[PDB]
Amino acid sequence: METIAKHRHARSSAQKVRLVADLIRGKKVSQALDILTYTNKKAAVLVKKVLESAIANAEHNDGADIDDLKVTKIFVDEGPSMKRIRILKRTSHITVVVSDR
Amino acid sequence: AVQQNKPTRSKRGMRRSHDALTAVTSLSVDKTSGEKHLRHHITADGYYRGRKVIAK
Amino acid sequence: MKTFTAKPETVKRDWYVVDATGKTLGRLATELARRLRGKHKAEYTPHVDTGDYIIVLNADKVAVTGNKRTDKVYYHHTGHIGGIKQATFEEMIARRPERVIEIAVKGMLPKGPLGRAMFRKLKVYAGNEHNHAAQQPQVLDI
Amino acid sequence: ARVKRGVIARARHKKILKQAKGYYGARSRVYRVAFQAVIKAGQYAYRDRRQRKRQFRQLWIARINAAARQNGISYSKFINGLKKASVEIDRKILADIAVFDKVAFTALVEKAKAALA
Amino acid sequence: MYAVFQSGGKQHRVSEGQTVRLEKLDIATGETVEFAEVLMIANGEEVKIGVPFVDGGVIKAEVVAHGRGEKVKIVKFRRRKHYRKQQGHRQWFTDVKITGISA
Amino acid sequence: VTGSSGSIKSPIWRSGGVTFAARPQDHSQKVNKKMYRGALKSILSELVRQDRLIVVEKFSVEAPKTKLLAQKLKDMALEDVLIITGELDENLFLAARNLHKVDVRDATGIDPVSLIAFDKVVMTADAVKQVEEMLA
RNA sequence: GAACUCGCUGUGAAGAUGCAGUGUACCCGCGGCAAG
RNA sequence: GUGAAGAGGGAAACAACCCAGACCGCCAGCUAAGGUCCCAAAGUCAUGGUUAAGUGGGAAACGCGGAAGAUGUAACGGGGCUAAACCAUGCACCGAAGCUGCGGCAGCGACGCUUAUGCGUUGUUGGGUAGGGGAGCGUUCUGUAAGCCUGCGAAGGUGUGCUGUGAGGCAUGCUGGAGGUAUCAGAAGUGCGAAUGCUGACAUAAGUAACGAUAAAGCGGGUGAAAAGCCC
RNA sequence: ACCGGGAGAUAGCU
RNA sequence: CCCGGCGAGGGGAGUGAAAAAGAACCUGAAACCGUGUACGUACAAGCAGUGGGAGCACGCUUAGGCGUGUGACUGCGUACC
């Protein structure tokens, strides 16, 4: 069963989160959680929270067998920006997908 | 100090090839508490080499 | 209908041996370039290798007519400052007999990846003996 | 009566871009450069529709010369023999047959040699 | 079993049962055309054309269909002279199958 | 444009003026009386020649009821007609407004577009004479 | 404006990264010397 | 004469140098200038001569000398050539969009069946700036139209296939969830690629300097999930 | 010095 | 109901024709930024294309050499006004 968890309007730059994201793609959830916990970047906490929400949704909606979840898809997208004097503040949309297969 | 032409997206992507981070891949399990931690650091619960510390 | 083309993986190429002694440098170089280009074969095509490997023996004893022995000179500009390294023909042939044949053949061939591929098929030695006895290279008469 | 041009402009841009697929990025997405790229490609195709004949004729000439030299006659002498023999076969057919068959080309070249004198 | 024949000023080397492409021909779709012009006969022993259009050889080609060819766009433009005109073209074509070649 | 380097009110500028904004004008054309009467004669001739015209001694309704007019048309096998008569009939006009497909006008009210649009025209004994003397 | 942004000789609305010839260079980063 | 306003081949590159006037398509053939040692398609072709110096591959007046030329030979396009340099005499080939062969379209004439007013022949033309003339396509509304399609899927968006010499047209998958409009005529706020044109959005330069007086912070506890910046 | 109007002012050129 | 900080945000359930209508709410194209899939690139020099073109993956006439996707190499090619 495929589970999807997303975070909208994150307080982070659009591209500064892809660096953290690359460490998730193709990695098992068990090791992915630990890697994110021990990462130093600010976006690491947001990515960890998103992944935790994803796994929680998967286990609650799915019956059992939490241990065999692998992160299949993960990406970060441009979000709405705030304009001030000339300065532009970006926003990030995080999307994560966890599925046993 | 002024660019005569706009660099393309391919050049920018190539310039960002060295910005990739590195996974720790160095999780060591505690002797007794049985929870993994970064090597040469006390665990969150407050263990190291099996020996006990304040663990406030 | 489409004209026939030479598939690189199904090309029948053999070996040959050419004796450089007693042959004019320019003429033998041109013949070697023609053979490397594969033009002699009926399956010539300007976008795929079709020539035959050539082995040259006794490059040091090549025959050249006229005053080319002293008049001919070789120049290469490596760069930096004062890259004016001259090489007289006699000195080059005495030290590097193979380099003269190599540069002549490379000049006779096109410039580019295809030309480099053509040139890489040519082997040149300064003596009769050669290590490529396992390919059964038929002697080339010319 | 005010008329909005959105539909027409969008259709024109879609049609022009659809012909500019695979042109190394900017040319394939930006109309300003896509139009120039497609026009230049059209001119190049117009020239190529005539350069193709020259290229194929040169390739046929090379193949015929290669085939004739093996049999022991230059291309010019071979053509002289064919013409003096009242043979109108073109170079393209000879080039095509030289690779699929060799006996026919051998017969043609020996006939040319015989009829040369 | 390859024979060389010309229909619209272009020579074609075709065998038996092999479809060939030629310019527009004023022949019915369901009928067959006998080209009395031959340039080569191939067999265990070939019949060279000592003279053009050897009588002993003849080609029988049956038309299978007609139609328009692939669309080709021709565009003319000039260097900063404000000349620009494009037009389509679809050359007519005919596909014919050859069945049997006389020796 | 209400308002006040270039100018804000230039048409090229956003929310600016119009380069060639028009003014309220009348497009009515001038038609010669001879030309108009010739056109009327031509249209009437074509209409009669194809047999689009029906003539009756007198077309009227006894009472101002639309249902009676509908029944009268039904028994005559006509649905889309233009009833043209002489002196305006009060009952017919009163009981003809509700039927859009059916139009009734006096002799002087004939118009070319009305004749074109409607499939058939129903005259009267006096209407034919009235139109004949009107066209002259 | 778009770039898959080398050297030398030659020509060119006249010192050519883009035209003819030839030579060199694995792909991509970081710090300065400023000849451009 | 050419360019202006003529494409193409050749002179290595090149607009005024030579040949040569591009209707469109074909993987056919013959030529003009120029070439036939390789690069690069064609003769390492024949005959009679000159050259020993790479003069060819740059040079006058003047008694072969005269002769000294450009980052590097750099005044052969590179190699290389003692003929692969030059002179004269030939047979051949290559050589363009030139010509011919096949197919298709259009203008201009002419002939007739004369028509139903077109058809079948017939020669010729078809580069083009400014400019002139002729012929068409796209959209809003009006009447046609209380017609037609349409909740069994309208407009719009987005792909595919088929279509005409063109601007364009039709069918259909998906999204769309309520309008569109046949044929024929009328009015146009009528077709966008540049005016340092204008509103909005989105970029590169870039994760780049700076984080701003060079008065200075360290530690234990508390709140708080998160505390070099909060409180003690 | 600034504001609204004559004023969409006038010559050439871009 | 669950994760989340008794947040922001999100996943299930339900209503709703539709949540591919969620209060940032009809339709939602381009510029711009991403993941996946197919192919090419780490010996290769220039208005980045045009013809030739092997190769590589999929569906088709169940081959018959067909189309789509990319384009190793090669002749030619000095942007718009």
Author numbering:
A (entry chain S): 1 to 85, 95 to 110
B (entry chain 0): 1 to 56
C (entry chain J): 1 to 142
D (entry chain Q): 1 to 117
E (entry chain R): 1 to 103
F (entry chain E): 52 to 55, 70 to 201
Paper text:
The E. coli 50S large ribosomal subunit is composed of 33 proteins (L-proteins), one 23S and one 5S rRNA. The 23S rRNA consists of six architectural domains that, stabilized by the L-proteins, define the shape of the 50S subunit with its three protuberances. Here, we present a biochemical and cryo-EM based analysis of the earliest period of 50S assembly, utilizing an in vitro reconstitution system with purified rRNA and L-protein components. Taken together, early 50S assembly occurs in a domain-wise fashion, while late 50S assembly proceeds incrementally.
Once densities for domains I, II, III, VI, and their interacting proteins are present, the large subunit´s core has completely formed (state C). While state d1 can mature to d12 and d126, an alternative route involves state d136. Both states d126 and d136 can convert into state C (d1236), a process we refer to as core formation, that enhances base pairing between the 5‘ and 3‘ ends of 23S rRNA. While route 1-2-6 initially yields a core particle lacking density for domain IV helices H61-63 (state C−), maturation along route 1-3-6 culminates in a particle with these parts of domain IV stably folded (state C and better defined in state C-CP_L2/L28). Hence, initial appearance of domain IV benefits from the presence of the maturely folded domain III. Specifically, rRNA contacts with the already formed domain III helices H56-58 seem to induce formation of domain IV H61 and H63 in state d136, and H61-63 in state C, thereby initiating the incremental formation of domain IV. Subsequently, state C transitions via intermediate steps into state C-CP-H68 (48S).
